[PDB]
Scaffold this active site. Structure first.
Site, short mmCIF file in Angstrom:
data_model
loop_
_atom_site.label_atom_id
_atom_site.label_comp_id
_atom_site.label_asym_id
_atom_site.label_seq_id
_atom_site.Cartn_x
_atom_site.Cartn_y
_atom_site.Cartn_z
N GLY B 31 22.34 19.22 23.97
CA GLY B 31 23.75 19.58 23.98
C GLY B 31 24.06 20.92 24.65
O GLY B 31 23.23 21.44 25.41
N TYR B 102 21.45 34.35 17.11
CA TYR B 102 21.90 34.65 18.47
C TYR B 102 21.09 35.80 19.17
O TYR B 102 20.99 36.93 18.66
CB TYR B 102 23.42 34.91 18.49
CG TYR B 102 23.94 35.62 19.72
CD1 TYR B 102 23.87 35.02 20.98
CD2 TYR B 102 24.57 36.86 19.61
CE1 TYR B 102 24.34 35.68 22.11
CE2 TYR B 102 25.07 37.51 20.73
CZ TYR B 102 24.96 36.92 21.98
OH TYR B 102 25.47 37.57 23.09
N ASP B 148 7.25 22.56 26.54
CA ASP B 148 7.90 23.24 27.68
C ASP B 148 7.96 24.77 27.49
O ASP B 148 8.99 25.41 27.75
CB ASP B 148 9.28 22.64 28.02
CG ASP B 148 9.80 22.95 29.42
OD1 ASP B 148 9.06 23.58 30.20
OD2 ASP B 148 10.94 22.55 29.73
N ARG B 152 11.81 30.82 30.43
CA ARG B 152 13.17 30.28 30.30
C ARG B 152 13.49 29.81 28.89
O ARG B 152 14.66 29.84 28.52
CB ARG B 152 13.45 29.15 31.32
CG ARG B 152 12.54 27.94 31.18
CD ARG B 152 12.70 26.90 32.28
NE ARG B 152 11.68 25.87 32.15
CZ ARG B 152 10.57 25.81 32.87
NH1 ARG B 152 10.36 26.69 33.85
NH2 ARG B 152 9.67 24.87 32.64
N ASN B 153 12.47 29.41 28.09
CA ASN B 153 12.64 28.91 26.73
C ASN B 153 12.21 29.93 25.64
O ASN B 153 11.84 29.57 24.52
CB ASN B 153 11.94 27.55 26.58
CG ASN B 153 12.60 26.45 27.36
OD1 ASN B 153 13.83 26.33 27.40
ND2 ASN B 153 11.79 25.61 28.00
N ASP B 166 13.96 25.81 21.46
CA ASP B 166 13.83 24.37 21.71
C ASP B 166 12.41 23.92 21.78
O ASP B 166 11.90 23.50 22.84
CB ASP B 166 14.63 23.93 22.93
CG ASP B 166 16.09 24.36 22.85
OD1 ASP B 166 16.66 24.37 21.72
OD2 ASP B 166 16.63 24.75 23.88
C1 LIG Z 1 14.94 25.15 18.40
O1 LIG Z 1 15.58 26.33 18.90
C2 LIG Z 1 16.95 26.33 19.14
C3 LIG Z 1 17.41 27.29 20.04
C4 LIG Z 1 18.78 27.36 20.34
C5 LIG Z 1 19.22 28.41 21.33
C6 LIG Z 1 20.58 28.97 20.94
C7 LIG Z 1 20.80 30.34 21.40
C8 LIG Z 1 21.31 30.79 22.63
C9 LIG Z 1 21.35 32.16 22.54
N1 LIG Z 1 21.72 33.15 23.48
C10 LIG Z 1 21.96 33.04 24.87
C11 LIG Z 1 22.18 34.16 25.71
C12 LIG Z 1 22.43 33.89 27.06
N2 LIG Z 1 22.44 32.62 27.59
C13 LIG Z 1 22.20 31.63 26.72
N3 LIG Z 1 22.22 30.37 27.19
C14 LIG Z 1 22.22 29.19 26.32
C15 LIG Z 1 20.82 28.75 26.02
C16 LIG Z 1 19.63 29.11 26.52
C17 LIG Z 1 18.69 28.32 25.83
C18 LIG Z 1 17.19 28.31 25.98
N4 LIG Z 1 19.27 27.53 24.98
O2 LIG Z 1 20.66 27.76 25.08
N5 LIG Z 1 21.96 31.75 25.39
N6 LIG Z 1 20.89 32.46 21.32
N7 LIG Z 1 20.54 31.38 20.59
C19 LIG Z 1 19.70 26.47 19.69
C20 LIG Z 1 19.20 25.51 18.78
O3 LIG Z 1 20.12 24.67 18.15
C21 LIG Z 1 19.71 23.37 17.70
C22 LIG Z 1 17.83 25.44 18.50
#
Ligand SMILES: COc1cc(CCc2cc(Nc3ccnc(NCc4cc(C)no4)n3)n[nH]2)cc(OC)c1
Ligand SMILES: COc1cc(CCc2cc(Nc3ccnc(NCc4cc(C)no4)n3)n[nH]2)cc(OC)c1
Lengths: 281, 282
Positions: B31, B102, B148, B152-153, B166
């Protein structure tokens, strides 16, 4: 018949052919012994002899004569493969040149990789010699067009000698490398070959030296290399290579040909760096 | 069943009026991810800046299933400092919102790129590797294989804390235009065998990414050519400004025989020792 030049001509009975060294440019190369090249007329000198292959054409002959004729003009230097003589009469053309027993610089550097060893000062000294050789060729108004470690031969006394001076992109070498990976972009895209496009190739040769015979852009095909050059990508700094020496490689790969260092500048800087480079590691 | 209603879990469930959605952060796995503010997560009246993952409008019953599964897994996996943790969820009376921690400094690759000289010390870089290995060792103990692991992750927090994100086609490229096959172990890439030892290899490529300050692995190398490099047993060149101990660690992660690679527990042990012996003066 070929015309006679007594300044260079050697009687055939004064040349004893030995084991072949491998395929060279415009023909094949064999190890030989020349009886009395200079006095002494009784001393043997171990030499390299280039002649044509059995499948060679009138065009392949003209190329071999031309290379010999050019070597006559270019004159002698320590860091180039020099002409020693020739058998042009009463039989096939034998172009007698200097013999380098330790093969090409790629193989030499590869054979001396850690698990005989070369110190940082020895590696800088390799770069110095090639630049000294190229600077001499440049003064003789000669553009190599394929300056690479493969075309630098190492003698018994570890002296660097530049070989075959003065093409399909998808044509690979004997070791399976792509020669386009040594070409300045203007030579590759615009077919403009200058002393400045050879300086770009010296930059790739420097990378080859400090990676101890590393293959440039491994796994990168031709169409992808163009994409890298057009994007202005440059090879990563080798490990065990100073920032001054990487700066130098990057100068050689200056996008603008007029902004690249000349071989005279490279000889000057390399002379200074040798002197300041430790032989302790 | 989840077509008309999702089951409730009151240990995690949050009232929708306690979540104020903000600017989107980007597309995530299964998503999209948006910035949000959660009113009183613990205990009350305090706002916590959080990350919210939900489905895109074009998502299918299968995409929902995937998002629930990831949330359900995070419930099992439990909390750790070096992973993105679950904070709550809105599952009832509207679309699924998976509330998570976050990380404001983006992904490790962007983080490392933005901090390149024309700053992070050698000790800071080794500390990055340590944290990722601590996070992976935790995930491994929870019987989880990432599949993965790449810069990037790995998200980086306001307080410079590394967090694995993820955690579980060859000609499919990323948003930055890189090929993910360049991170996979040969057994995963030829025999499709994905193990904890495959994640050790990807950790090897991540270490190279760290010491090159966000360097692109094998630049200009296509897929068919990468297989040729791996089959030939080619190994990426030692980065500049990277010790022989740290390169040998990369090479150990890059062992052809999976059983001969270090485990994450070993990597955590060695990195712990190296961080302590690495100067912060340069
Ligand atoms: C299993 O780990 C996760 C990780 C996430 C990542 C969510 C997230 C994004 C975030 N901060 C930023 C900062 C800048 N750009 C982004 N991009 C969105 C992004 C990158 C990734 C990797 N996943 O979403 N996120 N902090 N936490 C969500 C999640 O929901 C089911 C499960
Ligand atoms: C302009 O320079 C040359 C160089 C050569 C190469 C002669 C040569 C071979 C040699 N030693 C070795 C060592 C290992 N392997 C080989 N292989 C044959 C070879 C090398 C090169 C270069 N061309 O053919 N030669 N030293 N000098 C011939 C020549 O004849 C017109 C002119």
């Amino acid at each position: 018949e070929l015309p006679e030049d007594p300044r260079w001509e050697l009687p055939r009975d004064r040349l004893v052919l030995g084991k072949p060294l491998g395929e060279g440019a415009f023909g094949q190369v064999v190890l030989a012994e020349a009886i009395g090249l200079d006095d002494k007329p009784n001393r043997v000198t171990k030499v390299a002899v280039k002649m044509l292959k059995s499948d060679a054409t009138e065009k392949d002959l003209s190329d071999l004569i031309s290379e010999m004729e050019m070597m006559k003009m270019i004159g002698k230097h320590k860091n180039i493969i020099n002409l020693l003589g020739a058998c042009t009469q009463d039989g096939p053309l034998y172009v007698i040149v200097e013999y380098a027993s330790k093969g090409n610089l790629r193989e030499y550097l590869q054979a001396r990789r850690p698990p005989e060893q070369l110190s940082s000062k020895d590696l800088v000294s390799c770069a110095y010699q090639v630049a000294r050789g190229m600077e001499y060729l440049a003064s003789k108004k000669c553009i190599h067009r394929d300056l690479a470690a493969r075309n630098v031969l190492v003698t018994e006394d570890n002296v660097m000698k530049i070989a075959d001076f003065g093409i399909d992109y998808y044509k690979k070498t004997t070791n399976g490398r792509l020669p386009v990976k040594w070409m300045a972009p203007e030579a590759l895209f615009d077919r403009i070959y200058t002393h400045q496009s050879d300086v770009w190739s010296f930059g790739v040769l420097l990378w080859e030296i400090f990676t101890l015979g590393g293959s440039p852009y491994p796994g990168v095909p031709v169409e992808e290399l163009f994409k890298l050059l057009k994007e202005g990508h440059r090879m990563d700094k080798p490990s065990n290579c100073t920032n001054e020496l990487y700066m130098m490689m990057r100068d050689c790969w200056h996008a603008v040909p007029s902004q690249r260092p000349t071989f005279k500048q490279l000889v000057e800087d390399l002379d200074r760096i040798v002197a300041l480079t430790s032989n302790q590691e």
